[PDB]
């Protein structure tokens, strides 16, 4: 198919879920997987394992593109910031960079109100 031998894995690690989107360097998505879509729901969905499994399922579904080197970009606090990067390496990619791109406002917009649980 396309000549993509070096892309970027975008890891969106929320508290509730992990989305892994592999893309070319220009930012066009090639494939993706989520902890939510990998047969993990509710409490199991928000685990480092479900994120691992998602990263496995995302490594598959960019086999056709023929990627070898990927930079990793990790958003979010959630479980599976790190279990996702391990899984990408274990799936036989050459991890090149690991940036963190969690957006911090320099003050900015008022967050929602504190939960009273």
């Amino acid at each position: 198919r396309k000549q993509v031998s070096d892309g970027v894995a975008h890891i969106h690690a929320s508290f509730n879920n992990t989305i892994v989107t592999i893309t070319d360097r220009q930012g066009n998505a090639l494939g993706w997987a989520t902890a939510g879509g990998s047969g993990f729901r509710g409490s199991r969905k928000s685990t480092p394992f479900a994120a691992q499994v998602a990263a496995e399922r995302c490594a598959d579904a960019v086999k056709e593109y023929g990627i070898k080197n990927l930079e990793v970009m990790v958003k979010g606090p959630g479980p599976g910031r790190e279990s996702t990067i391990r899984a990408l390496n274990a799936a036989g990619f050459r991890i090149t960079n690991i940036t963190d791109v969690t957006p911090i406002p320099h003050n900015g917009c008022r967050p929602p109100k504190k939960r009273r649980v």
Binding site: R44, T47, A50
Partner: protein
């Protein structure tokens, strides 16, 4: 227990074969302290298992155990007011304890004539799979695989 965390003791070897493993198996099978009754049932059932499948007496027994011994099982942890069914590696002693308990439990459910037949069939079943004890093992593994997230 809280303080002194000691248990178990010396056992005699099986009279016939000289196997502590097999002596435990008799104890699982025994009821109401009728050990003579139990070891008669085991020997009858092993005799049949030996002539049926070939092999030695204990060699046939161990093969049945190999196919029912669980590797992992779910526990319960309570982290922050929330019960997770965490899978934990079952120790070697408990490994064959559950194996032996599930075989006996299965054998007592079967609707054959003698316990010795019931048991012999269940040992044969276990050695080839398809039995109720191997279903227990399989079920225990599926439970543990489902909760691999909580490790």
């Amino acid at each position: 227990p809280r303080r002194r965390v000691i248990g178990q003791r010396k056992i005699l070897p099986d009279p016939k074969f000289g196997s502590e493993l097999l002596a435990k198996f008799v104890n699982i099978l025994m009821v109401d302290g009728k050990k003579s009754t139990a070891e008669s049932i085991v020997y009858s059932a092993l005799e049949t298992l030996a002539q049926r499948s070939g092999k030695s007496e204990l060699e046939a027994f161990e093969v049945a155990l190999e196919n029912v011994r669980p590797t992992v099982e779910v526990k319960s942890r309570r982290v922050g007011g929330s019960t997770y069914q965490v899978p934990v590696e079952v120790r070697p002693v408990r490994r064959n304890a559950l194996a032996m308990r599930w075989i006996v439990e299965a054998a007592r459910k079967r609707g054959d004539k003698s316990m010795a037949l019931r048991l012999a069939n269940e040992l044969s079943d276990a050695a080839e799979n398809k039995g109720t004890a191997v279903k227990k093992r399989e079920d225990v593994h599926r439970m543990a695989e489902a909760n691999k997230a909580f490790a």
